[PDB]
Every structure is written in C-alpha cells, then in structure tokens.
Amino acid sequence: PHRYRPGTVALREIRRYQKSTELLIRKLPFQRLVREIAQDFKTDLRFQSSAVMALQEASEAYLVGLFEDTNLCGIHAKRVTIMPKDIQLARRIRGER
DNA sequence: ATACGCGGCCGCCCATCAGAATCCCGGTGCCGAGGCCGCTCAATTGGTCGTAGACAGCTCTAGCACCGCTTAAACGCACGTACGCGCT
C-alpha cells in the first residue's frame, strides 16, 4: 500500500496552478465580506457584479506576490517553511506600513 | 705643675609679617526676535458675459434577493515522515 513521499504532490500543483489564470477566492464569501466593511462607513450600498471582480483580482494577485517575498527570506535562513516573522519582516522592509 | 672658668652651640617655647585662597560681587560674547523700509509687481477691486453644472424628469439597465437541484470543495481527523530548530 502506497502514499506519495512528502513534497511530491505540492510542487506538481504549484505549476498546474501557475499556468492558469482563473481566480482562487470564492465569489459569495468575498462579496459578503466586502459588503460588511462598506456598511461600516455607510450602510446598505450596491455594486455592479463586475465591480466586485475588479476588486477581487487586485488583491488575489497581491498576496501571491507577498508570499513570494516571504519565501526568499525563508530560504535565506537555510529554512524550508515560510514562518511568521518572515512575512512581517517582509512587511517592515518593504516599508509599506 | 694642677685645678677652675667659659664660650659659642643649641633645643625650647614664643613673638611678627607676608602670601595664598575662598567668597563677594562681574563683564563679555552669542543668539534670535525685532524694526526699519522701499521700490513694486502681484493680488484686489469693481464689472461684464456666458457657460458649466446644478436640478428636476425620465426610463431603463443591473444589482438584489431568493430558491433548489447538484457536487465540487472544504472539513476534521489519523498517522508518520522529513523538516524546524537546538546543540556543539
């Protein structure tokens, strides 16, 4: 009986997932969340279904980029798994915040 | 030939006059608001025309809601491997 050796599945997908364009985040929950905050400035406002996507794309890509910076720093240390600080470390250096 | 005298020397406590050092009052240099000001060219003033844009009417897209059949994706847990990370 058989189970793939660790780290054999993850890379395979990386690429599969790298080749394609299609969004990873969910249409319903995303939307609800967007509505949640927008209400908190002013309550009960509307957006064209696309207007929601416009918003959805700009952030989905945004993370994937940060994860990439997080990874280099994980590597720089002789490590293998993106730890917390690395993200923060990354955040601090970019000096966005 | 043999015995007495003393002489400046000196430690002693005791006296006089100048110099060192702290406190009572100080001048000096640096920084930053002030004042002065004056020739003047950019804002203000009084004024006309016209056009953006507020506004009200209107219609006509699309954002919401809502439902249920279908199912892919998320979930949670079980088991172990191969890394995080600690030490030397």
DSSP character at residue A1: -
The DSSP output letter for A96 is -
Q: Which residue is nearest to nucleotide B84 (CA to C1')?
A: A79
Distance between CA atoms of residues A80 and A71, nearest Å: 8
Measure the CA–CA gap between A48 and A54, rounded to whole angstroms. 10
Closest-CA residue to A82 (of A62, A56, A63, A57): A63
State the method: cryo-EM
CB within 7 A of nucleic chain B: A 5-7, 26, 46-52, 74, 78-81, 83
Q: Copy the structure tokens of residue A6.
A: 């660790």
Sequence-ordered list of residues with C-beta below 8 angstroms from that of A86, at least 6 positions apart, any chain: A70, A73, A74
What is the CA A54 to C1' B45 distance in angstroms? 52
Resolution in angstroms, to 1 decimal, for this deposition?
10.0
